[PDB]
Write an enzyme that holds these catalytic residues in place. Structure first.
Site, PDB file in Angstrom:
ATOM      1  N   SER A  42       0.809  -1.216   0.000  1.00 61.90           N
ATOM      2  CA  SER A  42       0.000   0.000   0.000  1.00 61.90           C
ATOM      3  C   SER A  42       0.846   1.271   0.000  1.00 61.90           C
ATOM      4  O   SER A  42       0.298   2.374  -0.154  1.00 61.90           O
ATOM      5  CB  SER A  42      -0.969  -0.079   1.201  1.00 61.90           C
ATOM      6  OG  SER A  42      -2.132  -0.875   0.864  1.00 61.90           O
ATOM      7  N   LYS A  45       0.308   3.781  -2.797  1.00 63.47           N
ATOM      8  CA  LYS A  45      -0.804   4.720  -2.831  1.00 63.47           C
ATOM      9  C   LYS A  45      -0.289   6.138  -2.725  1.00 63.47           C
ATOM     10  O   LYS A  45      -0.918   7.069  -3.214  1.00 63.47           O
ATOM     11  CB  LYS A  45      -1.817   4.405  -1.707  1.00 63.47           C
ATOM     12  CG  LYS A  45      -2.684   3.158  -2.055  1.00 63.47           C
ATOM     13  CD  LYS A  45      -3.249   2.487  -0.843  1.00 63.47           C
ATOM     14  CE  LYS A  45      -4.244   1.402  -1.225  1.00 63.47           C
ATOM     15  NZ  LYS A  45      -4.292   0.304  -0.214  1.00 63.47           N
ATOM     16  N   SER A 102      -6.193   3.527   3.606  1.00 62.00           N
ATOM     17  CA  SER A 102      -5.654   2.495   2.743  1.00 62.00           C
ATOM     18  C   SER A 102      -6.755   1.837   1.920  1.00 62.00           C
ATOM     19  O   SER A 102      -6.662   0.659   1.573  1.00 62.00           O
ATOM     20  CB  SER A 102      -4.860   1.462   3.555  1.00 62.00           C
ATOM     21  OG  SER A 102      -3.988   0.770   2.651  1.00 62.00           O
ATOM     22  N   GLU A 138      -5.144  -3.508  -6.877  1.00 64.31           N
ATOM     23  CA  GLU A 138      -5.424  -4.001  -5.519  1.00 64.31           C
ATOM     24  C   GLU A 138      -6.502  -5.079  -5.530  1.00 64.31           C
ATOM     25  O   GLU A 138      -7.506  -4.963  -6.246  1.00 64.31           O
ATOM     26  CB  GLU A 138      -5.882  -2.863  -4.629  1.00 64.31           C
ATOM     27  CG  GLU A 138      -4.825  -1.832  -4.325  1.00 64.31           C
ATOM     28  CD  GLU A 138      -3.854  -2.326  -3.237  1.00 64.31           C
ATOM     29  OE1 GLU A 138      -3.108  -1.473  -2.703  1.00 64.31           O
ATOM     30  OE2 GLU A 138      -3.842  -3.538  -2.919  1.00 64.31           O
ATOM     31  N   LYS A 206       2.734   6.374   5.200  1.00 70.45           N
ATOM     32  CA  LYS A 206       1.833   5.388   4.606  1.00 70.45           C
ATOM     33  C   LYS A 206       2.438   4.012   4.798  1.00 70.45           C
ATOM     34  O   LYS A 206       3.611   3.806   4.479  1.00 70.45           O
ATOM     35  CB  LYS A 206       1.622   5.674   3.122  1.00 70.45           C
ATOM     36  CG  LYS A 206       0.709   4.664   2.490  1.00 70.45           C
ATOM     37  CD  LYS A 206      -0.759   5.002   2.807  1.00 70.45           C
ATOM     38  CE  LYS A 206      -1.722   3.811   2.544  1.00 70.45           C
ATOM     39  NZ  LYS A 206      -1.658   2.756   3.592  1.00 70.45           N
ATOM     40  N   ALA A 209       0.997  -3.789   3.943  1.00 70.47           N
ATOM     41  CA  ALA A 209       1.116  -5.163   4.385  1.00 70.47           C
ATOM     42  C   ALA A 209       0.779  -6.099   3.235  1.00 70.47           C
ATOM     43  O   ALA A 209      -0.010  -5.736   2.368  1.00 70.47           O
ATOM     44  CB  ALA A 209       0.166  -5.436   5.541  1.00 70.47           C
TER      45      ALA A 209
END
Length: 264
Positions: A42, A45, A102, A138, A206, A209
């Site tokens: 993530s 992002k 997230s 994602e 940010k 995982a």
């Protein structure tokens, strides 16, 4: 010394650890596996929002544009977008949800608007990042398979790219501030770096995982009376459970920041 401490944490983790601490004013760094690949998860992002803002800067995107979508578009971990199927969300709301909570569907909607993972990678090439690549959407991009170069960066590249985006001129002053503001408003992953800092230190960050025991964080930190520092920390292929992985990232972050500032 520091490299021995990190190697010991790396061996306790059962995994691979990568770190950069970078002084944005001098380019001085602490580096550990800085030239190896790690999964972004993530933390990508942050780059996605930067690419969106660069399109806004160029007159190709509008932060107020409303995007509509359906329940059938929602993927795992979509805490904000799952609430706005009926009314849609603006580009700015999606950027905010992607960075601060997230939100995965928000990231996918912004990626789609850009033109897909290939368009994000092309943006990164455009600002001098030759290494970082996004290939998937994602949440598939979190697979973190060993030896898989898809959806990876190198810590040294991520750190340099953040320096360019946050303190260089790839974005307008207004977009630069907006990107910092979203990172400062991040609400997840606070155990990894924020918990360990004095309260008068500024931080935008940010976390990420993934599968194969993977956890990471990127941050921009403003110590009082000091130039900002960029911290990027990665763990992958780890063999300990989720809580131990968080604790590994946090202890890496404690050690490396202390070492960086106790440069006497």
């Amino acid at each position: 010394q520091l490299s021995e401490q990190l190697a010991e944490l790396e061996k306790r983790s059962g995994g691979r650890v990568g770190v950069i601490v970078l002084d944005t004013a001098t380019g001085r760094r602490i580096a550990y596996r800085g030239d190896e690949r790690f999964p972004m998860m993530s933390t990508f992002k942050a780059l996605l929002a930067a690419a969106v803002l660069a399109r806004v800067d160029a007159g190709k995107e509008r932060l107020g544009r409303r995007i509509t979508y359906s329940k059938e578009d929602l993927v795992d971990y979509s805490p904000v977008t799952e609430k706005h199927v009926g009314d849609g969300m603006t580009v700015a709301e999606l950027c905010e949800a992607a960075i601060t909570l997230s939100d995965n569907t928000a990231a996918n909607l912004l990626l789609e608007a850009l033109g897909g993972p290939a368009a994000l990678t092309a943006f990164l090439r455009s600002i001098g990042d030759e290494v970082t690549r996004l290939d998937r959407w994602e949440p598939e991009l979190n697979e973190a398979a060993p030896g898989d170069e898809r959806d990876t960066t190198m810590p040294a590249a991520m750190a340099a790219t953040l320096r360019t985006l946050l303190l260089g001129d790839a974005l307008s002053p207004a977009s630069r501030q907006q990107l910092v503001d979203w990172l400062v408003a991040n609400k997840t992953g606070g155990k990894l770096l924020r918990a360990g800092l004095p309260a008068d230190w500024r931080i935008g960050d940010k976390s990420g995982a993934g599968e194969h025991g993977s956890r990471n964080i990127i941050a921009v930190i403003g110590p009082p009376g000091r130039a900002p520092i960029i911290v990027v920390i990665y763990l992958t292929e780890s063999q300990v459970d989720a809580d131990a992985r968080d604790a590994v990232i946090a202890e890496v972050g404690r050690l490396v920041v202390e070492a960086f500032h106790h440069h006497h």
